[PDB]
Amino acid sequence: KHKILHRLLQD
Amino acid sequence: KHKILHRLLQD
Amino acid sequence: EDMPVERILEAELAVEPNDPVTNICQAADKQLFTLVEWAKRIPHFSELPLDDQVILLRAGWNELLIASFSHRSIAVKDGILLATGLHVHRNSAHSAGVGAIFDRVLTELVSKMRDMQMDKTELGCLRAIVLFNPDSKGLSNPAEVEALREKVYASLEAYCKHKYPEQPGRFAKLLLRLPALRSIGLKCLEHLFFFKLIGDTPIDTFLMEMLEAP
Amino acid sequence: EDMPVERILEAELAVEPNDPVTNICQAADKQLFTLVEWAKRIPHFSELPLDDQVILLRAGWNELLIASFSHRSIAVKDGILLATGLHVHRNSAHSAGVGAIFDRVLTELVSKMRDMQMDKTELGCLRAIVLFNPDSKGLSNPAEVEALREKVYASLEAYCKHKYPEQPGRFAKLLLRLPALRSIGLKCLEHLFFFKLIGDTPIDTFLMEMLEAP
Ligand SMILES: CC(=C/CC/C(C)=C/C(=O)O)/C=C1\CC[C@@H](C)c2ccccc21
Ligand SMILES: CC(=C/CC/C(C)=C/C(=O)O)/C=C1\CC[C@@H](C)c2ccccc21
Numbered sequence: 480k481h482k483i484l485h486r487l488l489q490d
Numbered sequence: 491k492h493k494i495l496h497r498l499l500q501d
Numbered sequence: 502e503d504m505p506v507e508r509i510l511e512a513e514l515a516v517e518p519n520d521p522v523t524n525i526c527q528a529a530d531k532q533l534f535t536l537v538e539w540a541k542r543i544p545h546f547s548e549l550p551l552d553d554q555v556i557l558l559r560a561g562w563n564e565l566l567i568a569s570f571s572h573r574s575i576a577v578k579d580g581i582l583l584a585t586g587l588h589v590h591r592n593s594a595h596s597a598g599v600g601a602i603f604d605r606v607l608t609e610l611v612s613k614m615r616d617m618q619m620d621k622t623e624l625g626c627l628r629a630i631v632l633f634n635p636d637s638k639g640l641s642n643p644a645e646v647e648a649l650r651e652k653v654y655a656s657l658e659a660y661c662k663h664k665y666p667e668q669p670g671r672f673a674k675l676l677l678r679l680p681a682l683r684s685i686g687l688k689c690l691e692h693l694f695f696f697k698l699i700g701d702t703p704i705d706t707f708l709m710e711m712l713e714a715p
Numbered sequence: 716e717d718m719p720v721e722r723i724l725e726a727e728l729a730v731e732p733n734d735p736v737t738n739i740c741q742a743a744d745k746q747l748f749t750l751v752e753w754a755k756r757i758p759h760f761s762e763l764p765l766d767d768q769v770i771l772l773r774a775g776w777n778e779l780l781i782a783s784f785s786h787r788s789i790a791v792k793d794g795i796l797l798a799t800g801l802h803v804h805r806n807s808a809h810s811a812g813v814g815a816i817f818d819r820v821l822t823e824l825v826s827k828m829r830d831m832q833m834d835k836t837e838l839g840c841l842r843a844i845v846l847f848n849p850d851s852k853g854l855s856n857p858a859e860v861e862a863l864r865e866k867v868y869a870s871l872e873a874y875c876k877h878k879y880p881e882q883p884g885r886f887a888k889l890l891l892r893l894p895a896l897r898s899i900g901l902k903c904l905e906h907l908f909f910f911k912l913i914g915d916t917p918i919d920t921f922l923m924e925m926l927e928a929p
Contacts, residue, residue: 481773485769494706499537499541608850672887673872673890677864
């Protein structure tokens with residue numbers, strides 16, 4: 480869930 | 491339109 | 502110019518001393534009559550053209566009534582107190598299919614009003630700000646309503662910082678409850694419109710007139 | 716404690732230097748990537764648990780992007796300027812079936828931002844307040860988000876009264892644009908959900924993910 484969002488917030 | 495409301499606001 | 506909190510507070514004190522949904526609706530119709538009287542007691546409101554008074558009330562009634570019973574329910578455990586003297590418990594609203602919105606009222610409104618100890622004067626001033634909504638479509642003179650709204654939150658801030666000097670962020674905290682109030686207000690209307698569509702849930706004449714067009 | 720407007724202003728300056736609906740949607744997807752970067756530049760936002768950051772953004776993206784292009788469209792005649800450099804004129808939005816909401820954006824947001832000359836710092840502070848919404852469901856520590864929101868509007872008010880001493884009601888005027896923003900935000904989502912249902916109007920991956928569940 481919320482794949483894209485998490486990846487962007489992590490980097 | 492808005493029968494009740496008008497009557498109450500007038501009195 | 503001229504918008505004392507004393508008059509506002511007075512308007513607040515002067516108007517207020519089985520299926521849960523049905524009860525809430527009946528209580529809403531009852532309060533609508535009282536809302537008109539409350540408004541008339543708000544400074545300069547009656548000096549506005551009749552059509553504009555009608556416009557403002559039809560635009561803010563739902564948020565105005567929510568703000569009222571929410572503040573009245575501060576001492577309530579897990580539920581709200583209706584103007585009819587009836588109590589709607591959280592579990593009861595949940596068992597009726599309105600748990601989500603009901604919980605939002607408790608969490609975003611009732612709970613927060615209680616945490617900051619919002620007083621009647623503050624409640625009144627906020628309802629006055631809602632009443633005087635310059636964004637209402639059709640207003641003959643929106644700038645005028647805007648001015649009244651400004652005079653209200655100007656007196657409100659003055660009231661704060663003076664009664665609660667220790668809390669410099671109070672005034673802002675009260676105003677930041679409006680976004681939630683606007684949302685909750687919009688959601689309650691949707692439910693009401695659905696109830697009217699299904700036919701179930703008796704809707705009285707005054708509440709029904711508010712659910713008219715526009 | 717610690718929430719300077721300088722950092723906020725910087726975050727604002729760092730992120731921003733045929734069917735109209737389709738264009739608006741594409742521009743929304745594009746801006747969502749930039750929104751994440753903007754947020755990371757907001758003090759203490761990244762120090763929150765990942766899940767909470769996800770919760771706040773998914774809850775405020777629509778109002779955050781509306782606030783952005785609305786302020787960017789202040790100099791625009793009768794329309795808005797998209798981040799893609801495209802212009803959507805009022806007549807064009809009307810000819811697409813989105814005239815009502817579009818007009819609300821111009822009247823309740825763009826027009827008012829222009830009348831008071833809202834500056835980037837004020838815009839940034841307001842978006843920060845929206846980002847830090849303590850009412851977001853699921854938050855691991857709502858009290859924490861609440862504190863951040865408070866520190867933001869505390870710095871905002873300080874900024875005002877100092878930059879615009881002549882306007883004592885400015886701070887309140889900026890905060891009183893949020894109720895409208897919340898409403899307009901809710902309405903845009905409805906439209907978007909309907910567009911996704913009908914299938915027409917291409918919706919990119921990022922915008923589509925925001926339209927997920929909850
Ligand atoms: C707009 C509105 C107003 C109610 C006002 C009341 C009940 C005021 C009062 O009694 O003091 C409707 C509500 C407000 C309360 C919520 C829980 C609700 C849920 C389903 C249907 C309607 C409602
Ligand atoms: C939530 C949202 C955001 C758009 C964001 C943009 C376009 C930002 C930007 O380009 O800067 C959607 C809108 C926002 C603008 C209004 C006119 C609209 C109408 C129909 C469908 C969608 C929309």
